[PDB]
Write a protein that binds this ligand. Structure first.
Ligand SMILES: [Cl-]
Ligand code: NA
Length: 209
């Protein structure tokens, strides 16, 4: 019937709407003490508006990106070269922790893109308050690898790359990406890839010869 998505499962929350994005958490299940801890969510990024309602039993976040932002599946339709550049910007955005209590969960359902293929997150956690509510660099690294493979290689869904990559049809650069030790080595693998792919696209505007 209705399976919960990776986001839903990791947040233990319900996506009740996608127009506009709306996430519903049970207050009883949160580490949140003072609802004021969630005010930081008003200050994630100037493009995407987030309205927060802390009621006696639930916390509701309503997330409204600009109407001209592109979904993950829209970027998946662009050129390989373009998708790898997008993936580089993603890895560059999450490479570090926030100093302002914000914690990032990376998956295709949680991302939208601006006109310059800059990624933005929809839902963001708050340390010790709202899931994801703790750092876990390993979890973030795996999500990023799966999300980047889903965007670039794109021969499987995010969940399948995430969950199952040791059992599926691994490609050479993909293999390099899973292999990578940390986000910087993910970024190095991508950089050699975008160079390779840029040389290929350029060859298409010269006629040898
Ligand atoms: Cl050229
Ligand atoms: Na750590």
């Amino acid at each position: 019937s209705e399976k919960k998505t990776y986001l839903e499962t990791q947040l233990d929350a319900v996506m009740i709407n996608d127009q506009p994005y709306t996430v519903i958490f049970q207050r009883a299940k949160l580490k949140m003490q003072d609802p004021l801890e969630l005010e930081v969510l008003k200050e994630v990024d100037p493009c995407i508006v987030r309205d927060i309602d802390v009621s006696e039993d639930e916390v509701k976040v309503v997330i409204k990106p600009p109407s001209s932002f592109l979904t993950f599946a829209a970027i998946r339709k662009t050129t390989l070269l373009s998708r790898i550049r997008a993936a580089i910007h993603l890895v560059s955005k999450v490479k570090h922790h926030s100093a302002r209590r914000l914690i990032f969960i990376v998956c295709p359902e949680n991302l939208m893109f601006n006109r310059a293929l800059e990624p933005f997150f929809l839902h963001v956690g708050v340390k010790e308050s709202l899931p994801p509510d703790e750092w876990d660099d390993e979890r973030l690294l795996r999500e990023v690898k799966a999300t980047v493979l889903a965007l670039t290689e794109g021969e499987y869904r995010f969940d399948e790359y995430l969950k199952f990559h040791e059992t599926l049809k691994c490609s050479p650069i993909a293999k390099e990406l899973w292999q990578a030790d940390h986000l910087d080595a993910v970024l190095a693998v991508l950089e050699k890839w975008v160079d390779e792919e840029e040389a290929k696209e350029r060859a298409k505007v010269h006629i040898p010869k």
